[PDB]
Amino acid sequence: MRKIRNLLLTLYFYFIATVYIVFYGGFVLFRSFLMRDREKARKYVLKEIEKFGKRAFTWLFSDVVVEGSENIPKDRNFIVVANHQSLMDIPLILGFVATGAFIAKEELRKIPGVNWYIRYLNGVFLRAVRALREAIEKLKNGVTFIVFPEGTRSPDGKVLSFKKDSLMIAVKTGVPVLPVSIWGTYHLIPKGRWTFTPGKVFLKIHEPVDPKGFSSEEELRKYVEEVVKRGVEELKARWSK
Template sequence: MKRVISFFYTIYLFVGATIYVFVYGGIVLMIGGLLRLFSKNLSKKFVVKQIETFGRMAFKLLGIKVYKFGEISKTDNNFLIVSNHQSALDIPLVIGYVTPAAFIAKKELAKVPGINWYLKYLNSVLIDRGNIRQTAAALKEVVKRLRRGVHFIIFPEGTRSEDGKVLSFKPRSLELAFKYKVKVLPVSIWGLHRVWKKKRFLIERHPVYIKIHDFIDPKDFNSEEELRIHVENVIKEGVEFLERRHYSEES
């Protein structure tokens, strides 16, 4: 019976996401296009705000309770959001409950109607992973956008965690932050690995927890490795805190 409920729950998610992206999303972009005739800045603010709203609505429509701890400290500087990776739903969670941010994504997403529109509005950079020269050029573009105040999000583990534990960060995964002295905003996520398990199609209802940490300044570290290990430990401690919080509320 539980699998049957999960099946219809999953279908509900995909149908709802499709309707949003192609119907509501189309309306949002049409309004954004009209606003662009008067002000590019106003147009972008409107569309990005709607993307943030979608991030939150994705969980409300699924009936998934999100527990949020912490807020972003006020800053005039650009920053890099660094989060652990548990599910494809990490992206709407971060966009909705932290802040809309750009992604370093695969170039194939440029061919997906709807998704490519939002990537563009968020100032994301697309990479051809098999093309070393193009990847290098794309990373230079990321640096340019970071300097213009665009926030990016990365998942340094490189893959989803099956049990919710934080995996080791990939070597040099925080090279951009360290080399260009871009502040890091660590974010810890727990619970999404149970909502949408790795290598599983079905989605299940489960509470989700997210913790926003304080900014970390790369200037305080002597190497990328030292910075990376520190950020990894901060996120690990956050995940452990969120897991304990969940079980204390269950008991």
């Protein structure tokens, strides 16, 4: 019966999430297209995305809690660097940190609704990684990125090593890295499971890092890695309620 509840929750999530992304999200872009004033059209679409990020977790009866909102740069783009432990990490970062570009599986272009919004956020689909050039290029024009240097979701919640050259997009653009630590989306929906289970999600936003202060990509990566990791640990251990 705890199984019944979770499955029904799962159905409720996919149904609402799909109708919301496709039909309401179609409607959103459709209204934004009709807007004379292009700057506020952008604001409208962006705000709706952020609202989706947030609303997502309400559809799961899962409470988000954010600290370090004050650290998120304003007037400027950045590269969110986060640990990765669920599909829900993307809606989480979108709704509570930044509505930026991300790197999608080639697959995703074909899924309706999602592709329109990945494109709107100026995302980057995956010779074998030409990606890196668009990301760099997009960064230079001013797009915020969201980057999961581990390169995969942790299977057990534990933070994996940051893949070598993972912070190269910061090094080669000079845009600030905004380290973020996510805890609880893994208990919500873990790698390889297709069902949800409610729970609390915590998010800790850390002080922006300037790549300028680092003799190499490899030294920056290590700094950000300890920062993120330590967050996860503090978050994993905090009692609350």
